[PDB]
Symmetry: D5
Subunit: 156 residues, 10 copies
């Protein structure tokens, strides 16, 4: 039977415990996800409180991080999502994604409406991934791909 949380602090506290175990073992997110059959972004988001693992994955990652049974159970609960402490991020890495919305949010709305129509690009029928690509001018770039279904607003 599905089980769900109503207070994010329980899963976020567990995420802090998971990160200390991870660092003591000198593990990467890529190696924790490897073998689960699940994408690294999904498994990472679950460890950080924002997705629920299926039971087999929760046991797999639980063994790798030496978690106890209550923590393996908690990773399978549907979370009360929301990773930002107080609405706007303070951390510079996270903030730049907020700034992208402050600069391009109205452009994203306008172009979605022109290409698709009235309605939204979903954050639920949705996936994202992060890739590193060489910059031809030197250094490295991240290409982050947001891929969401269009859901139309029609008249009723």
């Amino acid at each position: 039977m599905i089980q769900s949380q109503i207070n994010r602090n329980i899963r976020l506290d567990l995420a802090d415990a998971i990160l200390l175990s991870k660092a003591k073992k000198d593990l990467s997110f890529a190696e924790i996800a490897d073998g689960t059959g699940l994408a690294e972004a999904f498994v990472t988001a679950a460890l950080l409180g924002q997705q629920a693992l299926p039971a087999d994955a929760a046991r797999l990652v639980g063994a790798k991080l030496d978690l106890d049974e209550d923590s393996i159970l908690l990773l399978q609960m549907i979370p009360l999502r929301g990773c930002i402490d107080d609405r706007i991020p303070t951390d510079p890495t996270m903030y730049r994604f907020y700034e992208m919305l402050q600069v391009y949010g109205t452009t994203l709305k306008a172009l979605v409406h022109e290409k698709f129509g009235d309605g939204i690009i979903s954050a639920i029928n949705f996936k994202l991934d992060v890739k590193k690509v060489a910059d031809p001018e030197g250094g490295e770039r991240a290409v982050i791909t947001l891929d969401g279904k269009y859901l139309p607003t029609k008249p009723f």
Copy 2:
């Protein structure tokens, strides 16, 4: 000489006027950007007050929308950026991008640090684009690509 603004309401009120003129002419953002040499996302963001157009582009779009000389001049001023009325969007279309940040912000941080290092993905050396494609299960998806330079945080 470069010229800059300190109150966003001047360019946002210009954007409202632009959009009325666009609608009376039954124009698209794609056709407005046609012939400028510049990407639709960048041009549209300038119309909506979030970027500056080079003089030639400003004249080109200004002839298409029948703008007066002060409006063409304002399009070339560096803006006081920030398109969200009050920190969190109310509009559903814009809000889903904010929800992507509430659900995957910490994951984006974690995977950026693992793949690149300490530091940021820039929102300045940065480009974005929106493509429409079919969904293999039916309907349509948006693939939005955020492409920013990695800038490292190093000890000093």
Copy 3:
């Protein structure tokens, strides 16, 4: 070509003018929507700045309300949605719906997860209606039906 707005106050000022015209004519929202083919909640929401009308419906309601051509065109533009002035309503009628969320929001989350699974009930593939019924104990009751598609959250 679809056209969209980025500042809610244009459509909200139109809504105030619509209301004054409506009052001078002693019109009801039911009679305004009559003839359009569209549900009274959807037409009323467009008048109040939260939906877009198709052209024929815009022209029809525009004739009933004596609207000018710029107003008719504005009702066809996709709005920057968000009807609450500052996040939490002050008006008692609207505030009771917010209070329903404060009392039952976590119960709605828990029972949506038990009945459907992880994911959301959509606010976009969605219809609402308000029906007046008799209260068998005396008086009248509103039965407000929120009818949204279940969109699952699945691992990837």
Copy 4:
């Protein structure tokens, strides 16, 4: 003698303990409410800190979840209601109900005044329920019924 609470954290802490017991026992909210004579939405809201259980229901659910005597007494206290952590939900499932108010809140106002008159639809002489319905286009929909008494505002 009726007893009441003044700080929500006592019952919300109890709610987190209840959810952990429920998960360990792999119980559903439907099974917890069975035998009580009360609707699942009501009993679930009480477990989550937003309603008071009558003594016999408190003892029933208490035995199912192996709660101690103080927890069984706290479920009978009238709560300090308010389930949303900080005014606007961050959780997607909960946020969509908030977005329904941002899009349709003024329309609910307008139609309540047209159909009933000045006043409110109560959140106190009130009930809700959640039903699952097949969608004809594929998938499932939730039909969430809000059913409140009209209470008039009259001159004095």
Copy 5:
């Protein structure tokens, strides 16, 4: 047909015009409400944007204040209520009533639940009045009576 507003600034702008007319004419609220059949607190609240007047009272107050026909019409519309500019009052007179809630709000909750039960004292089925009483230690006291219907919360 009943008519309702969705932005409070229309009626609050009206209230400022009413106050200027009232001051130029050197009228009291008591004299304005005289002849309407309605309590001074209700008529005053309507002038200040927070209640609707029946048409005969709107016409009577409109004559006294030399209002125009659109303003007499606006006074009959059901308002978007909420008189405090930004949630907590700044004005000392208004603030003391907010302070009474900061000091005694939990006591009011507790004594309402003990004397009546679970539920609320209504702000809709509700009257208030302000009376001036001599203080036996010297000076004057205000006795403000809040008189609301008890509406119970019961299981379903």
Copy 6:
């Protein structure tokens, strides 16, 4: 010597302990205040952290609730007042008193200035009480009396 607090959470923690003791003993606030010579609204407010009890009343209530000597001392300290968690109540019972201010707060200002003059009705030279009265139409009403000294604002 008089002693005063600066962190509300000490007294609010004590309040929660008091309410648990009170519920275990099945006591009423009227019976706790019986024998103190003090009004039930004042005594209840002290229990809930918003007033100080004189030492004899603190020992009297402490006997009835079986409080330890540290708790009886704490009830005599002058509190850091403010019972609302975060400015606006979430609880429906408390909220309706806030809604009375949002509806009538400008009316109370205007009528206090008309009846008394510039200045305020005190919240310190002040008493409140709650009475239950039958409603002639059926049911029960609360009559809450707010009785405050008028303090004038004069030029100097």
Copy 7:
């Protein structure tokens, strides 16, 4: 008959026009108050929207500043007080008195309770003045004296 305001912006806009006129005439607050019989702090506060002037003073300062009849009338209304734009001042000169409260607020509470007892120092039966004194180490000091009645909180 006393007249009062509900929107501070009318008197704050008046204040801006008063200050322009004062600057064009190169007047000081001291000379505007000289001759009224009223303290400079009280007259200045009225000009700035935070007190009401008696009619003779309003005519005197209105002649000095060349105000029109509507402005002289507005100066006599009881204001909706609160001079800070958005709760915390941005201006450095004002902010330092807020910082006094952040550093010493609990000390003021503690010393008021020690010296006087439970209750408050009034902001209504209250005067302030500002004096310039030489600093013996060099330069100048402002001695600002806040002089308020103690009003006791007593049990009832």
Copy 8:
């Protein structure tokens, strides 16, 4: 070597421990500060987390209150100042000082600029004291003296 703090909660927790000790010993702030050669407002503010005591004063108060060595050391640390829990006080005693700013803040600004010039009255080169004196009309008044250095703002 001077030592500083970055989290106010350490010293505010000390303050709560100090006030419990003080109350158990039935001590006054006047007596705590006696012998220290420092003003009672300065010593009190250090106890409550808002100033640092020189080492001899720390030792001497620590003796009176029986503090442990981590607490006598902590009193000498430079605090992270800010005594108001959440920007605006809820306690009535503290709030009246905030209300003095809401009423007279712009008057204080205007009179400081006229009497001294552009710049500030310092909150750092600053002393405050509270005196109790009789009111000539009966009762008692607080005379609170804010004495700060003028620091000019001049061009560069």
Copy 9:
């Protein structure tokens, strides 16, 4: 006689008018400040509403921007300072200086107390400047120098 403002919108509206004049004339801030005898950062801040100009500088810049006589007088008024629209900047250029304080604010505090002692680095006995320096790894850097007097906090 010195003159001061109390609402920032008068000077910020002026700044917008100055900026439009500047752009029409294609002037730089360096050239506007030329001839004034004042630093470019000071003069620019005055044009943007955050400092006052002496009369000869105001007349000089006024002639270069073709300002009217009331504008030239406004530039001499002491401003109600505070350039950030709503506490945290949205503009990326401005936000990076805020992010410096989120990352280094507690380090600034720590190192100021270490090197100087308890007290502050002034923002009034203060100057800043911006210099462009080549980066040896390519490109350019800004060296922004904040230079403030240390003002100690001493016991009294």
Copy 10:
């Protein structure tokens, strides 16, 4: 493998423990950074939770502060940055840097665009230092140098 945090409180609690260790040892920040090869501002920021230390510097500062292994490991984790408790500082020393932004933030924007172009000065390719110098008028000054790379915003 690089490791990162997502909740600032883990490193901020570590900072508080580091500060108590430092105070017991009578250590300076300059002494703690000595021998690390890293600037005191960077090492002090790491101790306070806002930067990561390389492993050899972590071990070195850990030896000086008697830190346990988990604490040395936590200092090497990439932090969730953000040192201000709630957006605007309360502490006077911190606040003056914020005030520098409220007074000069728009001037910094204007001058960066004039000297460099559209774009930002980086807070990531960035160094800061604090230097104490004599004030030639008497006393001491801090010279705080902010040195960041200019990153241009160009059309795409």
